[PDB]
Design an enzyme around this catalytic site. Structure first.
Site, PDB file in Angstrom:
ATOM      1  N   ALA A 197      28.734  54.296  73.590  1.00 52.14           N
ATOM      2  CA  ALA A 197      28.773  55.746  73.796  1.00 52.14           C
ATOM      3  C   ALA A 197      27.339  56.158  74.188  1.00 52.14           C
ATOM      4  O   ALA A 197      26.501  56.462  73.346  1.00 52.14           O
ATOM      5  CB  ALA A 197      29.243  56.453  72.537  1.00 52.14           C
ATOM      6  N   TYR A 234      28.699  60.206  77.137  1.00 50.31           N
ATOM      7  CA  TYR A 234      29.907  59.575  76.520  1.00 50.31           C
ATOM      8  C   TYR A 234      30.019  59.710  75.007  1.00 50.31           C
ATOM      9  O   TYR A 234      31.110  59.431  74.444  1.00 50.31           O
ATOM     10  CB  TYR A 234      30.061  58.117  76.941  1.00 50.31           C
ATOM     11  CG  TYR A 234      30.552  58.019  78.344  1.00 50.31           C
ATOM     12  CD1 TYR A 234      29.655  58.137  79.429  1.00 50.31           C
ATOM     13  CD2 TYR A 234      31.917  57.835  78.622  1.00 50.31           C
ATOM     14  CE1 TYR A 234      30.121  58.058  80.763  1.00 50.31           C
ATOM     15  CE2 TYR A 234      32.388  57.732  79.956  1.00 50.31           C
ATOM     16  CZ  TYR A 234      31.492  57.847  81.002  1.00 50.31           C
ATOM     17  OH  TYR A 234      31.969  57.762  82.279  1.00 50.31           O
ATOM     18  N   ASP A 291      36.559  50.640  75.942  1.00 55.29           N
ATOM     19  CA  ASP A 291      35.836  51.848  76.410  1.00 55.29           C
ATOM     20  C   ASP A 291      36.050  52.997  75.467  1.00 55.29           C
ATOM     21  O   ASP A 291      37.137  53.083  74.808  1.00 55.29           O
ATOM     22  CB  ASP A 291      36.438  52.216  77.790  1.00 55.29           C
ATOM     23  CG  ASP A 291      35.859  51.358  78.936  1.00 55.29           C
ATOM     24  OD1 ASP A 291      35.114  50.372  78.716  1.00 55.29           O
ATOM     25  OD2 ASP A 291      36.248  51.642  80.066  1.00 55.29           O
ATOM     26  N   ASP A 350      36.009  56.418  76.345  1.00 53.84           N
ATOM     27  CA  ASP A 350      36.656  57.618  76.923  1.00 53.84           C
ATOM     28  C   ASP A 350      38.203  57.446  76.883  1.00 53.84           C
ATOM     29  O   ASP A 350      38.850  57.471  77.935  1.00 53.84           O
ATOM     30  CB  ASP A 350      36.103  57.939  78.362  1.00 53.84           C
ATOM     31  CG  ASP A 350      36.155  56.738  79.315  1.00 53.84           C
ATOM     32  OD1 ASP A 350      36.071  56.976  80.510  1.00 53.84           O
ATOM     33  OD2 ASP A 350      36.301  55.559  78.915  1.00 53.84           O
ATOM     34  N   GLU A 362      33.540  43.720  85.023  1.00 59.23           N
ATOM     35  CA  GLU A 362      34.972  43.415  85.189  1.00 59.23           C
ATOM     36  C   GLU A 362      35.248  42.258  86.140  1.00 59.23           C
ATOM     37  O   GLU A 362      36.201  41.457  85.898  1.00 59.23           O
ATOM     38  CB  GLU A 362      35.767  44.670  85.549  1.00 59.23           C
ATOM     39  CG  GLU A 362      37.264  44.486  85.910  1.00 59.23           C
ATOM     40  CD  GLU A 362      37.945  45.833  86.140  1.00 59.23           C
ATOM     41  OE1 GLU A 362      38.147  46.518  85.097  1.00 59.23           O
ATOM     42  OE2 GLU A 362      38.198  46.253  87.326  1.00 59.23           O
TER      43      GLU A 362
HETATM   44  O1  LIG Z   1      26.780  56.506  81.020  1.00 54.47           O
HETATM   45  C1  LIG Z   1      27.612  55.752  80.510  1.00 54.47           C
HETATM   46  C2  LIG Z   1      28.434  54.961  81.311  1.00 54.47           C
HETATM   47  C3  LIG Z   1      29.377  54.118  80.723  1.00 54.47           C
HETATM   48  N1  LIG Z   1      29.517  54.064  79.320  1.00 54.47           N
HETATM   49  C4  LIG Z   1      30.503  53.159  78.649  1.00 54.47           C
HETATM   50  O2  LIG Z   1      31.092  52.079  79.485  1.00 54.47           O
HETATM   51  C5  LIG Z   1      32.478  52.450  79.816  1.00 54.47           C
HETATM   52  C6  LIG Z   1      32.805  52.339  81.342  1.00 54.47           C
HETATM   53  O3  LIG Z   1      32.559  53.593  82.014  1.00 54.47           O
HETATM   54  P1  LIG Z   1      33.491  54.230  83.165  1.00 54.47           P
HETATM   55  O4  LIG Z   1      33.977  55.694  82.692  1.00 54.47           O
HETATM   56  O5  LIG Z   1      32.750  54.344  84.453  1.00 54.47           O
HETATM   57  O6  LIG Z   1      34.813  53.317  83.286  1.00 54.47           O
HETATM   58  P2  LIG Z   1      36.128  53.795  84.086  1.00 54.47           P
HETATM   59  O7  LIG Z   1      37.260  54.117  82.979  1.00 54.47           O
HETATM   60  O8  LIG Z   1      35.821  55.231  84.761  1.00 54.47           O
HETATM   61  O9  LIG Z   1      36.561  52.782  85.091  1.00 54.47           O
HETATM   62  C7  LIG Z   1      32.630  53.882  79.292  1.00 54.47           C
HETATM   63  O10 LIG Z   1      33.929  54.013  78.740  1.00 54.47           O
HETATM   64  C8  LIG Z   1      31.662  53.985  78.144  1.00 54.47           C
HETATM   65  O11 LIG Z   1      32.247  53.351  77.020  1.00 54.47           O
HETATM   66  C9  LIG Z   1      28.689  54.848  78.495  1.00 54.47           C
HETATM   67  O12 LIG Z   1      28.811  54.804  77.267  1.00 54.47           O
HETATM   68  N2  LIG Z   1      27.739  55.702  79.103  1.00 54.47           N
END
Ligand SMILES: O=c1ccn([C@@H]2O[C@H](COP(=O)(O)OP(=O)(O)O)[C@@H](O)[C@H]2O)c(=O)[nH]1
Ligand SMILES: O=c1ccn([C@@H]2O[C@H](COP(=O)(O)OP(=O)(O)O)[C@@H](O)[C@H]2O)c(=O)[nH]1
Lengths: 272, 272
Positions: free
Chosen positions: A52, A56, A138, A140, A230
């Site tokens: 986080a 985030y 992740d 989010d 990934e």
């Molecule tokens: O500034 C950031 C960018 C990414 N993340 C973490 O790494 C994951 C991947 O981010 P992203 O939203 O780009 O993945 P997506 O679901 O959009 O493909 C996020 O869920 C967060 O857990 C974070 O904590 N801060």
């Protein structure tokens, strides 16, 4: 509990085992009471890692409240929150046998390598004394339904919800032979999402160490794989095949993809 | 190799995973090239135990010639022939990386306990230094088709060919609460046959030690389970669930049961 039925497929509509005999975990494939028993007998502790960083931190309250309702309930859980803002971690009340640690984290290249490098570091020193399995997801996201010990195994990955129906040619694998994550056009079992993988501590130490060491090679050669860690997770899980694969029930986006009939449950979903 | 298909069941007619997520091994569920690789990378040695006592020595020549054609070909194999007649063991030519040892065996109660007691003794002292997995089968059988590393796992049992279609009430479990092998009327996953089980050396040490120690308790109490060591194997596999189950392709009697459509292959069959 009900007697299994040998002459009736647990599912008529989806593959429930891979061609290397790893289960593919869908609703209707498991009896959770049996699995909960087998894992409780071993006093299993599951570690859950989440990053986080920057804005985030705002996803943590709902991620944790919903994890409390649906993730590994009845088993021991240790959340590890990796964050640049320890004071922004919300104080969420936890059920018995569950704990949370905050791990403070300190250039976009290290940002790309951060998840794999940090899990590898902490998996060695030591998640290894604290948990039996490690799961990385992740932040989010929110849990909407049961995510429990059915997922636990030496090594698992999860089918990316955008690709579970696709031919391998359509998979967004890294396609440049100059990358460590390179997968040719005619290879590939599945397209796994970086947002949900895990396994025993040892197998997660191996996987993250491999991905981290591969990313550094890519960096030194001035290439960045099309989908970052990934891309490398997918190369890793091609060469070291997972012992369970989770269906997209475990990683879904209802806004983007709706609620198709082959998903009987939407367990862990993107937040809008 | 062909890309797995997520939205097509590997089989439309049979269960291919148990409710505790152990694969049920049928033709069409596995890609043998992938499995052969994973097991070769570990230099796997499979031990095969068979009893040939009194007139049963007569089944050894065909059992061994056919094992050479179909059992674990390409992997290391060590046959262990337990017999009261070492001079009646036929000299069968073996493929590279395959060996055979003859173990001479010395009252119907010890005869009933013999398989489990003898495998337990030798599994400790030591199959454990010689092989990675142990498989125990009956000798009055012949291999007709592929039986290979798809079966290997920590612990497996095989669906009895007479019962795979039956409700649990019809299973010939030991039904007397006075027996160690007792299973009540409302419990039971499957009916496993005593003629084909196995697993890692450790899990086979455990299982045979348990069954042997249970049979002795039964003996001391003047009861003999309705189907002898099979009754106890079934009680054991109820409480310690197998990590793969083999379909009846792996244990069939064509004279008695024919060749039904759900069997795509008849791999290991009774000799008339
Ligand atoms: O500034 C950031 C960018 C990414 N993340 C973490 O790494 C994951 C991947 O981010 P992203 O939203 O780009 O993945 P997506 O679901 O959009 O493909 C996020 O869920 C967060 O857990 C974070 O904590 N801060
Ligand atoms: O006198 C005997 C009786 C049994 N067996 C062994 O133990 C197994 C079980 O015997 P049985 O034929 O009674 O099993 P069934 O297939 O008839 O149920 C046999 O395959 C042999 O391997 C043996 O070697 N000598």
């Amino acid at each position: 509990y009900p007697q299994p039925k040998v002459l009736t497929p647990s599912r008529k509509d989806v593959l429930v085992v891979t061609p290397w005999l790893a289960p593919i975990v869908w609703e209707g494939t498991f009896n959770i009471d049996i699995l909960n028993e087998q894992f409780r007998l071993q006093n299993t502790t599951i570690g859950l890692t989440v990053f986080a960083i920057k804005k985030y931190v705002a996803f943590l309250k709902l991620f944790l409240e919903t994890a409390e309702k649906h993730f590994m309930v009845g088993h021991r859980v240790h959340y590890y929150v990796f964050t640049d803002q320890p004071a922004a971690v919300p104080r969420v009340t936890l059920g018995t046998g569950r704990q949370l640690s905050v791990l403070e984290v300190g250039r976009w290249q290290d940002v790309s390598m951060r998840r794999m490098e940090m899990i590898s570091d902490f998996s060695e020193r030591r998640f290894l004394s604290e948990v039996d399995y490690l799961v990385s997801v992740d932040v989010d996201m929110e849990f909407r339904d049961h995510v429990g010990v059915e997922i636990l195994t030496p090594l698992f990955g999860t089918l990316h919800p955008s690709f579970y129906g696709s031919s391998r040619e359509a998979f967004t694998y890294e396609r440049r032979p100059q990358s460590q994550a390179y997968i040719p056009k005619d290879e590939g079992d599945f397209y796994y999402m970086g947002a949900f993988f895990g396994g025993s501590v040892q197998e997660v130490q191996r996987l993250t160490r491999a991905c981290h060491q591969a990313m550094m090679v890519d960096q030194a050669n001035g290439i960045e794989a099309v989908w970052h860690d990934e891309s490398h997770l997918n190369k890793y899980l091609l060469r070291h095949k997972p012992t369970k694969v989770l269906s997209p029930e475990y990683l879904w986006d209802q806004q983007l993809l709706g609620w198709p009939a082959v998903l009987r449950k939407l367990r862990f979903t993107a937040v809008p």
